Design a protein around this ligand. Structure first.
Ligand SMILES: NC(=O)C1=CN([C@@H]2O[C@H](COP(=O)(O)OP(=O)(O)OC[C@H]3O[C@@H](n4cnc5c(N)ncnc54)[C@H](OP(=O)(O)O)[C@@H]3O)[C@@H](O)[C@H]2O)C=CC1
Length: 302
């Protein structure tokens, strides 16, 4: 099963691409034509050394994408494009529909369940775009999997990776749970889903029970790691709504999602027992997630 990843030089994309190559899956990486940044240069080299095949194009160019999917006999398409580029996926979906040979598409999800969560603006606009892509995918008859992996295991700053050394900003009561997942686990478990019969036309939720922490708990894990306590200060709901209300992109987007998670409980407030939802830890039993303690341990080694 040949995998095409768009957005492999991106934050999430680097983890997904590396996991695909480490799983011994034939892996093709879409590259923007032109000169290469030092960091892009770094990433593309690492991936090619792991056996990645670089292909040149842009996902908003339908005819170009049709040619690539056909020429390279692609089976599985994974998009990890950024928030600014969500509607660039429209041409890619039309291209996949035209070629008709795609076995699984994973659009650029990699956070919350955009069909259940209701963030304030401008987070909401991003979710409108993601929902529009899901509507197009489903109406196009493309088999899909939606990766709802919740938060990457970093410190959740309102404007956003390394936890604080001076004082902790605690959102609201600091007693609202979220799920934190290592980057490497987002990649590993994403790639397992692409050809699993059980994830076909499903939302895949990442709910590792040992990494279900509120902000007060997350603070305490960091204090254990640095061997000292810090002052805790409150950031109110209205603080976050003010920040969101300025409509400064992407800072205000991050503020809106912080509010949704840590004020409104968007990651934990629904059941996954229904027939269109599956959960990673029950799909792949006896395959432990890296803990937050472990993750914070490598931030310490920096
Ligand atoms: N905590 C969480 O769960 C988080 C989840 N996310 C979600 O992950 C997804 C990816 O975001 P992130 O990792 O921040 O994004 P990035 O901006 O780090 O990476 C985006 C990748 O998409 C590529 N790309 C963008 N447009 C095109 C295009 N038209 N054609 C081909 N390639 C393109 C970029 O290449 P180039 O540089 O050449 O333009 C880059 O390689 C988003 O849906 C975001 O919402 C991400 C961060 C937090």
């Amino acid at each position: 099963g040949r995998v095409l990843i768009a957005g492999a030089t991106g934050f999430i994309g680097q983890f997904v691409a590396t996991a695909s190559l480490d799983a011994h899956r034939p892996t093709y990486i879409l590259a923007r034509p032109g000169p290469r940044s030092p960091s892009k240069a770094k990433i593309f080299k690492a991936l090619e050394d792991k056996g990645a095949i670089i292909v040149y194009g842009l996902i908003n160019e339908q005819e170009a994408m049709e040619k690539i999917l056909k020429e390279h006999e692609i089976d599985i398409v994974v998009s990890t494009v950024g928030g600014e580029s969500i509607l660039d996926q429209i041409a890619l979906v039309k291209a996949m529909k035209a070629v008709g040979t795609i076995k699984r598409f994973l659009p650029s999800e990699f956070g919350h369940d955009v069909n259940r969560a209701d963030p304030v603006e401008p987070g909401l606009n991003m979710y409108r775009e993601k929902r529009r892509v899901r509507q197009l995918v489903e109406e196009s008859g493309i088999p899909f999997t939606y990766i709802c992996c919740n938060s990457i295991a970093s410190w959740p700053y309102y404007n956003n990776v390394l936890p604080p050394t001076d004082f902790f900003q605690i959102y609201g009561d600091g007693n609202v749970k979220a799920y934190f997942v290592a980057g490497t686990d987002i990649g590993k478990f994403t790639m397992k889903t692409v050809d699993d019969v059980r994830t076909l036309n499903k939302s895949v939720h990442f709910r590792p029970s040992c990494n279900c922490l509120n902000i007060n708990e997350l603070a305490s894990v960091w204090e254990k790691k640095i061997g000292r306590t810090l002052p805790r200060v409150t950031v109110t709901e209205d603080d976050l709504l003010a920040a969101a209300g300025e409509n400064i992109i992407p800072q205000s987007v991050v503020a809106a999602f912080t509010h949704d998670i840590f004020i409104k409980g968007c990651q934990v407030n629904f059941s996954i027992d229904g027939p269109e939802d599956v959960e990673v830890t029950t799909l792949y039993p006896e395959d432990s997630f890296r803990t937050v303690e472990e993750c914070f341990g490598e931030y310490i080694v920096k």
